[PDB]
Each structure stands twice: as C-alpha cells, then as structure tokens.
Design a protein around this ligand. Structure first.
Ligand SMILES: [K+]
Ligand SMILES: [K+]
Ligand SMILES: [Mg+2]
Ligand SMILES: [Mg+2]
Ligand SMILES: [Mg+2]
Ligand SMILES: [Mg+2]
Ligand SMILES: [Mg+2]
Ligand SMILES: [Mg+2]
Ligand SMILES: [Mg+2]
Ligand SMILES: [Mg+2]
Ligand SMILES: [Mg+2]
Ligand SMILES: [Mg+2]
Ligand SMILES: [Mg+2]
Ligand SMILES: [Mg+2]
Ligand SMILES: [Mg+2]
Ligand SMILES: [Mg+2]
Ligand SMILES: [Mg+2]
Ligand SMILES: [Mg+2]
Ligand SMILES: [Mg+2]
Ligand SMILES: [Mg+2]
Ligand SMILES: [Mg+2]
Ligand SMILES: [Mg+2]
Ligand SMILES: [Mg+2]
Ligand SMILES: [Mg+2]
Ligand SMILES: [Mg+2]
Ligand SMILES: [Mg+2]
Ligand SMILES: [Mg+2]
Ligand SMILES: [Mg+2]
Ligand SMILES: [Mg+2]
Ligand SMILES: [Mg+2]
Ligand SMILES: [Mg+2]
Ligand SMILES: [Mg+2]
Ligand SMILES: [Mg+2]
Ligand SMILES: [Mg+2]
Ligand SMILES: [Mg+2]
Ligand SMILES: [Mg+2]
Ligand SMILES: [Mg+2]
Ligand SMILES: [Mg+2]
Ligand SMILES: [Mg+2]
Ligand SMILES: [Mg+2]
Ligand SMILES: [Mg+2]
Ligand SMILES: [Mg+2]
Ligand SMILES: [Mg+2]
Ligand SMILES: [Mg+2]
Ligand SMILES: [Mg+2]
Ligand SMILES: [Mg+2]
Ligand SMILES: [Mg+2]
Ligand SMILES: [Mg+2]
Ligand SMILES: [Mg+2]
Lengths: 116, 146, 206, 65
RNA sequence: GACAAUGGUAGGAGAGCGUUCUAAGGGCGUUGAAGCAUGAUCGUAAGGACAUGUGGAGCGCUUAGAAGUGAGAAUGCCGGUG
RNA sequence: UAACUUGGGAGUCAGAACAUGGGUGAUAAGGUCCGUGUUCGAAAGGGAAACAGCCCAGACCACCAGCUAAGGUCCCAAAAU
RNA sequence: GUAGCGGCGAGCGAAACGGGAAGAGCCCAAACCAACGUUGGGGUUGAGGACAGAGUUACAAAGGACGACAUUAGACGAAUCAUCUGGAAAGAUGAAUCAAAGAAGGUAAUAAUCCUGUAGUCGAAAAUGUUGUCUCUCUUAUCCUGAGUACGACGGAGCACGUGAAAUUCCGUCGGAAUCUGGGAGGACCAUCUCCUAAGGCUAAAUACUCUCUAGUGACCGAUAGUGAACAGUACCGUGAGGGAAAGGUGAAAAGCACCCCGGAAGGGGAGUGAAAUAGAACCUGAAACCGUGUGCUUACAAGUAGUCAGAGCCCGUUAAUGGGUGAUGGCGUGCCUUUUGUAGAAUGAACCGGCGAGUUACGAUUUGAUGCAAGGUUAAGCAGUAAAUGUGGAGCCGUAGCGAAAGCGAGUCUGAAUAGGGCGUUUAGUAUUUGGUCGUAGACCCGAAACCAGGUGAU
C-alpha cells in the first residue's frame, strides 16, 4: 500500500509556528526560521533558568550591602558576624527584612556585631 | 484464542530497524555508514577475502591433494545403535533402513565398534570393523559380510 | 471426553466419545498464532508493482549539459526526485505464503478444536436431514440448537443441500471434515458437527 | 541465487570436526637450499586458518563441510 | 526504603510515538464524518484529546498483521508567490 | 573493581593545542617528526576582555536556598577603598 | 554451487542416477520381383530384410449423413411497511418478509425485500468451432542395409570445460576407410568386455509468450499518484531521426439567477432557484507562502543572529489555570546544515511556501530470539483443493563419526620403523519453519560524469 504525505507534516510545522508567536516578521511566519528560533529559545531558557538563581542572589547581596553600610558595616563583616552568631537566615530573607522591617534588621546587625 | 485478541509468543518478533529517518533513531543521516570512503557508497565495499592489495591468504597458501572419483563412503552403524533390536534378530541393510537406524545407504553399510552391544544378533552388513565383529561374536551372535 | 448428541429439534439423542488428544488437549497459543498468520499470509495476492526509472517512458537523454548552466546536474527527467520520475524500490510482485512443519499444522488444528471443546463451544448433532435446500428451515434449526451468530457447520463429506441451505445466512459457514482450518474454526464462536464428521476428525487428527 | 563457493580456497583447505579449517603451509614449493633442515621439517606440518582470517573469509567456504 | 548512576560525535543496544492498508471485535456519523481554522488542554518525547467555527460523507477505537511509513537542506523536481 | 574467553554489530586509519624528553630547522615558526601526560575532538558551566586545545570543573529535571574551585572584592561589575 | 573449467585470478559451472508432468511411434534408400534407367510391387533392422483393423495430429488422402455440446443476441427470476430527523431515508425506532438470492452497482444520506441485478432456470433463425456414431475409403550371411561419408592433418568454433592427458559435436582446406569374420561408443590410447548400428526423412503432449478477446481477482494507484496520456503520442520543440507536456470534481435535480438598479461593456447590489450561491460555472473542500483593510498595546537619543531570563505600565478575561495580549527598562546571547584539527565564519547549501524526493525485494549464507519434534528432524517438484489452509508426495537434504591427499582404517585416525611423541578427533543434539541483525548475487541507500559501443538521422 502507498502512504501519502498526508496531514502530519502540516500539523507538526503548525505547532512550531504557534510556538514562534510574537517573534519578529518572518520568524513568526516561516517554519524554517521559526524552528531555528524556537530551538534557540529552548537553549536560552535552559541557560537562563540556571543564570537567574545567580542573578537574584546577586541582587539580594547588593541590597544587604546597602543596608549594612547604613548600619556602618560591610556586607562581608555582617555575614561573618551572622555566621559566628549562628544565624542561618538566607540572603533573600535578609534583604526582604532590610526592606520591610528596618528595626528587626538593626537587631540582626547588632547581634552580628556582638558575635565579632 | 480469538481473532481480535491474537498474540505472538513472547520474544518471537522484533521490529525491524529503519535507517535514514532522523537523528533521534541514532541511524539518521549517514545511516550507520560513518563518513565517506568506499564503504559509505551505494554498492560500495570490496569483495570478501580482498585484503586491499596484499596477497590474499588463499593465494599465498598452496593447493593440496585431489578428489578420488571412485571414493566409497559407507553408512555407519555402531553397537549402541544395534542395541535397539531384540535378541535373536537377523539384521540386514533392509531391516536397518526400515527401522530407521540407517537413513541413506551410500556405498554400503559398515558396522563400527562404539558403544556396547548387550544383545545377541545375526548381523549381515557390507563391512565390519575388527572391534565390531569381535564384540558381535563375543556377545553370542554372529556376523557375515554380504 | 463424553459429549451430548442432539437432534435438530434439540432432543438429546445420545452420547459420543471424542479423543482427548483431538478435542481435549491444552491449546498451544504460540503454534495457533503462527498457523493463523500463515493462513492469512497465504490468502494474499501480491499483485502490486511500480515503474522504476528504467521502466518509466522516455527519459533517455541528458536534460542539459553537466556544467555551465547554473542548474543542478541531472541525468534524466525520469530520475526519482523528478515529478513523474521512477519509483525507488516500492512494491514488486511476490508471494507472501510460507510453510510450517506438518506436526505444527496438526497441533494448530488440535489447539483450535480443543479451544472450541473447552469454553462449551462445540455441539454434536445426530444427523442433517436436508433433502432440499431451504434457508429458512436451516435458520430454524440453528435457532432451535440455540447457537450464536458465528457458527461453523462441519459435515463428514460435501453435503450439497446443507451447504446450499446455510450459505446465505450471515455469519454461518459450512465445511467438511477434511476442510477444517484454523482461520474458520477460530473465527466461529460455535461448531455444529455431525457424529460421523466428529468420528472422522478424531480418526485423522488422531 | 545460490552463493558460490570460492574454488581456490576449497582447493586449499579442509573442514575439521569442530568447524576449523585445516590448511597447508607457504614456503613449501622450492628454494629449499635457502631454508634450514628444521625449517623444512616443521613446514611439512599443517596448521589451521587463523581466527582473524576466518572472520575475513568464512563466507567463501560456507558450503564446504 | 536506602544507596548508586544518568555531558556526548562516529557507532552498538533498548523502548516507544505517529502515517496508509488488512483481519477480527467493538463503535461513531446529516441531531453533521474526514479535512481545514482557532483556543488559555493533556503526556517524560515522538505526540493525544476537548470545545467552537468551517465543511458536507465518511471515520475512529482494541488486538494482531503488512508497508510506496515520518524531510529543512541534495547549485534536488514540479507548482504557487515574493 | 574489574579482567579474560567465545559469538552478533560496528565506526576509526586528515588529528589539534598546551606542558615536558628529544630529532630536524636557526636552543625560527600557530613549523615538522617521534616519546610522555592533559584538554579539544565528542564538553556545556566559572575564570583568562573577546578567545576549540590554558586554569577550575564534567550539565537527569525543577527552586527567587546554602558552601566552595580557579579567579577575585574603588566604579563599570558580586565581594575588603 | 557438487564434478570440473580458470592470468587455477575475477569468475564460469554441468551431467548421469533418483523423483515427477507428459507419453507414440513411424516412413523411405538398397538386396529382389514385373512393366515401360523410370515406374510400380519388396522392405525397414542390433541383427533385420531379400533369398532359401487403420485413418486425415506423424504413421495414405478426399468427402458425406446425423447427433450432441460450446461460442456469437437474449428471457424469467423471492421478499417492507410505518413513524422521527431531515431538502431528500437506504440512517434511528417499531413491527414484518425472502433467501439455491446477505455478490455488486444505482436510487436526493448508509437498502437482502425501490431499481439494475444476484442464486437458480430457460433460450438461437443464422454463422463459426469441438466432439461422437453410421458411412467412407486404405488395409487384412549367398545378396543388401545411406562414400568423397566416417576418419585424419592444419586452422577455427561449439561442448560447464580457456588445447589441455581432451574424449564427444560442427565448419573451411587438403587427404581419405571398412562392408556382419563389418562399423561406432564407454573422456588420450591399446587389448578384452559391455552397449549400440552414423553418414535419409516425419512425428502430437507435457514447455515458452500476451498487442488481443471473454469472465474475474488484488492487506495494488487514487489526479505531482496510477500508463507519457482519467480531459495525447495531441499541443509544443527539432531540417530530420527524435523529444514530448499541462489539463479531473456546480448541484440530488439546470431548477445555470425572470425582473429592477449603476455601468458602453466587464463587473456588481438587490430580487429569485436551491438544504446551501463565500455551491454562480476560473463553480466540492479551500492549507501555506504572498497581498490588503481595521486597531488593543508599543515605537522618532537609538548600535541590534532579534530571542531568552527579570520586569513596571496599559488593554483583556480562558479548556480557570499560582490566566491571555502588549511591553518602558535591566542581565545574558555571533542562525541552521554540511564538512572540518578547528567554521559567527569572509568555506558549502537553501528567495519563500506547498507537494514529491534516499538501505528495498528476491534467492542463498551466517547468527540470535521463538516454536514443533528429537537420534532423529524435514520434505522438493508433482497430484487433489477455492489462485487458500490443508492432504498426499521420503526423491532429496541436514544430523547420528572422525581421521587421511588417497587407498583406506574407524572412536579413532594421520604422520612415523615406533608398542614413542605430535595434529585433528571421541568422551551426544540435532533438525524444520520463522521475527531481528549482518554478508553474498542482483543497479542493491539516492542523485551526478567526462566517456565507450551499436543501429539510425543530418551538406536547406
Ligand atoms: K523401386
Ligand atoms: K582441431
Ligand atoms: Mg491510498
Ligand atoms: Mg512530504
Ligand atoms: Mg550556583
Ligand atoms: Mg550516534
Ligand atoms: Mg540532517
Ligand atoms: Mg556526507
Ligand atoms: Mg575521511
Ligand atoms: Mg568509513
Ligand atoms: Mg550506484
Ligand atoms: Mg529508461
Ligand atoms: Mg553529569
Ligand atoms: Mg547520555
Ligand atoms: Mg541499532
Ligand atoms: Mg521501535
Ligand atoms: Mg506506532
Ligand atoms: Mg517515503
Ligand atoms: Mg529544496
Ligand atoms: Mg603544528
Ligand atoms: Mg614549537
Ligand atoms: Mg604528543
Ligand atoms: Mg571529526
Ligand atoms: Mg568548555
Ligand atoms: Mg574525555
Ligand atoms: Mg588574551
Ligand atoms: Mg566570558
Ligand atoms: Mg566548545
Ligand atoms: Mg561564602
Ligand atoms: Mg559591587
Ligand atoms: Mg427483484
Ligand atoms: Mg569418434
Ligand atoms: Mg546405417
Ligand atoms: Mg487534489
Ligand atoms: Mg499523470
Ligand atoms: Mg508512473
Ligand atoms: Mg463556504
Ligand atoms: Mg471552492
Ligand atoms: Mg524616545
Ligand atoms: Mg545622548
Ligand atoms: Mg549582550
Ligand atoms: Mg582546513
Ligand atoms: Mg557576512
Ligand atoms: Mg565543497
Ligand atoms: Mg546560495
Ligand atoms: Mg522546499
Ligand atoms: Mg546493502
Ligand atoms: Mg536482509
Ligand atoms: Mg564485515
């Protein structure tokens, strides 16, 4: 029996084109360049799911450094003092406390200074 | 079973490998042939035994011997095969072929001395080994070259 | 082993002894599958063909010179990548039939018959008394015997009036003792066999 | 069609009980003054086709039993 | 439940997805099949549904069988259009 | 924690840099030919501005958790003016 | 794929026996007779001859009479109504009927009972064929036995066989026998033995093929497929030989749009037909590239493989999901394929979209899985059967024993003076079919040369 090409080709290519939605010009229209961009999009997304954790740790550290300098202390000194005092609050929570409850962050800084 | 519930025996059937159908099969593109060279080509590859121009083994070795046009080969029966018949039976080539011990008669029937006879028989054959004749005679029976 | 023997009116005429070696064995599903596949393959007519590049009409000359035109090199307008070109491989006529050892064939027949004897799918009639072909009367007989839609009717020899009476009812098929085959038996849900046919089946399948 | 036996090979080997191929020896035609007595005596003795050569040439002698 | 392993080209091994046809069984369809279009749906992947619109007569599912069975590249072929 | 034997199936026979023992060249070459090791090839990630072959280190998937390696902590640009 | 042939390379490759289909045997020349060397008789062979019921299918060739059958037109041929949805019922539901007929088409959707049909049965004025009975005729070792032959030499060829130890067959040139006490063959040749009887002819059947015809079939195509050709060897190209396309589909029914309006027309808007007209003929469905119209978010200080991760603002509201669209701004980020030591590469390839486009099949080999049987396993052709399964068919094939170049011997054997040593063996498992892998022969995964040969067409 003969198997014609049929509809599977169109269905698969349409899936790729739909994934390419919002891309510039031919990249949301033509299957070949859409497929190339979607492959790149996957590779980028994998890499960036990794890099985003570093990015947000970087942001938290920057904010903690600013708060510590407000309390006359460097980030490195503050973190060493917290470690010596046995406080395991991570950098996300530390930055969020420094933003929200300034008095609680001041208490944490005082404990860090005491441990040193 | 039922025609709507057929099942082949376990392990009796395996799907064939189809090359050149995409990367994920692991046999896409080059279809298992590697890259370039004579063996990558359609119809490519040297004849079996070819050694790339080094003298082939079956040219560097010498021919030996000859085939005898009048060579005789016998259907051989051993004593342990002769055990099948009961005591007092006269064994003939026709009897052997009938009972199925000998399938093809060839140039004749030769009795050989492997195994133990344990029966008394009158064995009529075309050839006997010395041990076969001695064992037949020493078990109480007799043999005759016919 | 022991089987009831009925009249065409349903009355239990008597009893028959059927060899366990024929109707009583444990069916060999592997061999039965192989036999069904073999019969189905033998039914195939492999009359299918295509025209390869040699067989397509025309296409002798080179379409254009090897070099200098700026086009891909081509050798004939009937090459496979050309519209209207030859087919690469594709179907070519051949038989699909293959053989199996005779002992395996017999084991398959016994497996099908024993599967019928198990599952209470076998019934023995005393005789068939059709002197003239009458489809309605045969349908009445089947209804009285209380048979399912798919029935295989087995007679000792070629019974023309039984065959003519039964051959128009959908799902009913009539065969002889020598004509029994795995496809027919497995397709049927019930076997209606005469006593003489059953005796012959026992005699030949042993 | 039927595969064809390699006739020269069939003229040069014989098949043993376990499936090995018995072969004659090279350097046994002439120039015997240039070879020691032990050399010729031991060249008189047959060998088997090696395993690697067998991997190469098995199909040439498939029908030869 | 507690331990271990899981980058990968040529390449070896395994398990699967989907396409057309066939057999048997069981079903859907003018109260609207296939196909086409859209969607914010589902599965580890190939891919599978559902709803709506279009369409106007065929088509799924289960098991098994068989293949002209899967294209993005061949200065590929034909057609259409930039 | 392999090793060996027997069978089925391969691909490979253009290699490259770096370090080191040497030939050749001119103690020239991102040269060439051998020995030894690593990496690339077939290896993403961090460092060396960028930079196959150097340094750290081998990505089953997810996380807006933590500790480190090489390399770093004035600003670009995370961390010591 | 044996024996053998073979730069003993690549390769080439029998036959006899055995099993089957089919089956069939005959006529002359010559010896010798009687008629005018030519005619009739005589005879046909492995020893015979001289001498002393068969037939127009060969075996001789012409008719008739009649019968029967077949083909070339045809005929009859069972059985269904209702409601529902629908434009339409064959569909759904209910209740029936026929069947030697439930093959298949058609009918306003899917029908055994509506139609054409099917099972079954019948039918021929005439013409071609086949086949019968009667007839019909035809008939009831003295001598010879194929001479420019056999055969030989030389040169070739055909034989599986390449000149070989080359028998056997044929051609050219040249030579050139014998005569049943004969002649030929048995693979150089001689002898013996065995078989046969050349140099004359005829002969059905089992076998080969398909432009055709009739009747049918398909896990064959379904409009880029299948014939090149569903509407063509046409159009078109070429001096010519020759090459050689594209192109199917309204609707159930033409009911194919009366009439009005703008317009020269084309084309439209209504109105009508139709179930439907975005079914209006360039007519089923109507994808993508590509071209337009409208606008929710956004954009004129910005350096870019166009995304991705983070993220306000604005606009919406879903297969209801820790939603959809857009996106100020920040981080990261040199397409894909091929080929390469190494390619963002300024190396290759692709304008885009769509369709088409590449490890297949047959026969062998080997290996593995599966299954059946097991010291056994298994049939091939054929015959029967429905183009089937299957039954029958044991010829043949592989195993049950190997070793040796061989004669041979044999659980051993070969080497060897050896009772030595050593090689290969013994010290049970095979076999048939088949899925998968791989190899061989085939074009053998697909496309591509420059060229070679053969037969033709061209001096417009
Ligand atoms: K005469
Ligand atoms: K000659
Ligand atoms: Mg089709
Ligand atoms: Mg396609
Ligand atoms: Mg990290
Ligand atoms: Mg691979
Ligand atoms: Mg590719
Ligand atoms: Mg390549
Ligand atoms: Mg290479
Ligand atoms: Mg290679
Ligand atoms: Mg080729
Ligand atoms: Mg051709
Ligand atoms: Mg890993
Ligand atoms: Mg992996
Ligand atoms: Mg594989
Ligand atoms: Mg698979
Ligand atoms: Mg599948
Ligand atoms: Mg294909
Ligand atoms: Mg292309
Ligand atoms: Mg270098
Ligand atoms: Mg250097
Ligand atoms: Mg080195
Ligand atoms: Mg490489
Ligand atoms: Mg790296
Ligand atoms: Mg490595
Ligand atoms: Mg640098
Ligand atoms: Mg960097
Ligand atoms: Mg890299
Ligand atoms: Mg730290
Ligand atoms: Mg900083
Ligand atoms: Mg009727
Ligand atoms: Mg002669
Ligand atoms: Mg003669
Ligand atoms: Mg179409
Ligand atoms: Mg066509
Ligand atoms: Mg075609
Ligand atoms: Mg429409
Ligand atoms: Mg249309
Ligand atoms: Mg601006
Ligand atoms: Mg500015
Ligand atoms: Mg950047
Ligand atoms: Mg280079
Ligand atoms: Mg550029
Ligand atoms: Mg190139
Ligand atoms: Mg280009
Ligand atoms: Mg394309
Ligand atoms: Mg191949
Ligand atoms: Mg194969
Ligand atoms: Mg190989």
């Amino acid at each position: 029996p003969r198997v014609k090409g049929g509809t599977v080709t169109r269905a698969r290519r349409k899936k790729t084109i739909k994934l390419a939605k919002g891309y510039f010009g031919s990249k949301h229209t033509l299957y070949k360049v859409a497929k190339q961009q979607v492959m790149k999009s996957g590779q980028y997304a994998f890499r960036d799911r990794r890099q985003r954790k570093r990015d947000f740790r970087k942001l938290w550290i920057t904010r903690i450094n600013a708060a510590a300098r407000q309390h006359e202390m460097s980030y490195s000194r503050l973190m060493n003092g917290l470690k010596k005092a046995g406080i395991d609050i991570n950098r996300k929570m530390l930055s969020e406390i420094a933003i929200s409850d300034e008095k609680a962050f001041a208490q944490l800084v005082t404990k860090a200074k005491d441990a040193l | 079973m039922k025609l709507h519930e057929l099942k082949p025996a376990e392990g009796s059937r395996k799907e064939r490998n189809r090359v050149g159908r995409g990367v994920a099969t692991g046999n896409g593109k080059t279809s298992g042939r590697g890259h370039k060279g004579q063996k990558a080509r359609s119809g490519g590859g040297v004849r079996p035994g070819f050694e790339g121009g080094q003298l082939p083994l079956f040219r560097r070795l010498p021919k030996r011997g000859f085939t005898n046009i009048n060579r005789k080969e016998y259907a051989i029966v051993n004593l342990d095969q002769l055990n099948k018949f009961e005591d007092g039976t006269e064994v003939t080539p026709a009897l052997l072929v009938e009972s199925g011990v000998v399938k093809n008669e060839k140039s004749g029937i030769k009795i050989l001395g492997n195994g133990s006879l344990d029966k008394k028989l009158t064995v009529k054959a075309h050839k006997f080994s010395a041990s076969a004749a001695e064992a037949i005679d020493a078990k109480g029976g007799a043999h005759e070259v016919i | 082993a022991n089987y009831d023997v009925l009249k065409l009116d349903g009355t239990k005429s008597g009893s028959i002894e059927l060899s366990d070696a024929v109707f009583g064995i444990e069916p060999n599903n592997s061999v039965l599958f192989e036999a069904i596949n073999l019969q189905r393959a033998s039914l195939r007519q492999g009359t299918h063909a295509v025209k390869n590049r040699s067989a397509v009409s025309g296409g002798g000359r080179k379409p254009w010179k090897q070099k200098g035109t700026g086009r891909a090199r081509q050798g004939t307008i009937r090459a496979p990548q050309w519209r209207g070109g030859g087919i690469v491989f594709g179907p070519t006529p051949r038989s699909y039939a293959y053989k199996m050892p005779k002992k395996m064939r017999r084991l398959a027949l016994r497996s099908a018959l024993s599967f019928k004897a198990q599952e209470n799918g076998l019934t023995v009639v005393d005789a068939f008394n059709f002197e003239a072909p009458k489809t309605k009367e045969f349908k009445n007989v089947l209804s009285t015997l209380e048979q399912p839609k798919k029935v295989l009717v087995v007679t000792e020899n070629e019974d023309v009036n039984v065959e003519l009476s039964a051959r128009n009812i959908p799902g009913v098929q009539v065969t002889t003792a020598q004509g029994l085959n795995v496809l027919d038996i497995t397709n049927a849900d019930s076997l209606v066999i005469t006593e003489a046919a059953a005796k012959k089946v026992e005699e030949v399948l042993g | 069609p039927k595969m064809k036996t390699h006739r020269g090979a069939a003229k040069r080997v014989k098949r043993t009980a376990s499936g090995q191929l018995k072969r004659s020896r090279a350097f046994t035609s002439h120039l015997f003054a240039n070879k020691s007595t032990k050399q010729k005596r031991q060249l008189r003795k047959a060998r088997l086709v090696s395993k690697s050569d067998m991997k190469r040439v098995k199909q040439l002698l498939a029908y030869k039993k």
